[PDB]
Structures are given as C-alpha cells and as structure tokens.
Amino acid sequence: RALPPLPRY
Amino acid sequence: TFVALYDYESRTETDLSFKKGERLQIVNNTEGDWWLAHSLTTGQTGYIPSNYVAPS
C-alpha cells in the first residue's frame, strides 16, 4: 500500500 | 492530537477521505504508515495515511 502521492508538485 | 495536513482522497470504498484542517483520532501509530483514525463528529471509521497528518 504505497503512500498517497503528494499534491500537485 | 493529530491534524490532517494534506487532504486524503484514496480510490477505495474502505479507507475514508478527509480534508486539510480536519482533526482525526489516531488509533494506532508508531507502527505502519497507514493508521486507523476515527472521527468524533459522525463517529465513524476512517483510515488516514501518515504523510497526510502530523502531531500538533
């Protein structure tokens, strides 16, 4: 379960 | 006391999603990046990632 992708960056 | 820094919007019907500024009751921490949080408002479950929240 990879962590959630960071916001637009 | 844990505050949701980034909004969590997973893509599953299990883990719940929250917004930035919403507090969450961390149930299990210092263990797996994904912890089980519980909302005290509606009183329901809500798994929240660790990179989206932090102790305040």
Swiss-Prot record, chain B:
Residues 1-56 form the SH3 domain. It is found in: Cell membrane; Mitochondrion inner membrane; Endosome membrane; Nucleus. Expressed to high levels, and with a high degree of kinase activity, in certain fully differentiated cells such as neurons, platelets and macrophages. Isoform 1 is widely expressed. Isoform 2 is expressed only in the muscle. The phosphorylated form is termed pp60c-src. S-nitrosylation is important for activation of its kinase activity. It comes from the Eukaryota. Belongs to the protein kinase superfamily. Tyr protein kinase family. SRC subfamily. Non-receptor protein tyrosine kinase which is activated following engagement of many different classes of cellular receptors including immune response receptors, integrins and other adhesion receptors, receptor protein tyrosine kinases, G protein-coupled receptors as well as cytokine receptors. Participates in signaling pathways that control a diverse spectrum of biological activities including gene transcription, immune response, cell adhesion, cell cycle progression, apoptosis, migration, and transformation. Forms a complex with polyoma virus middle T antigen. Interacts with AFAP-110. Interacts with GJA1 and PXN. This is Proto-oncogene tyrosine-protein kinase Src. The gene is SRC. The chain holds residues 85 to 140 of 533 of the full protein.
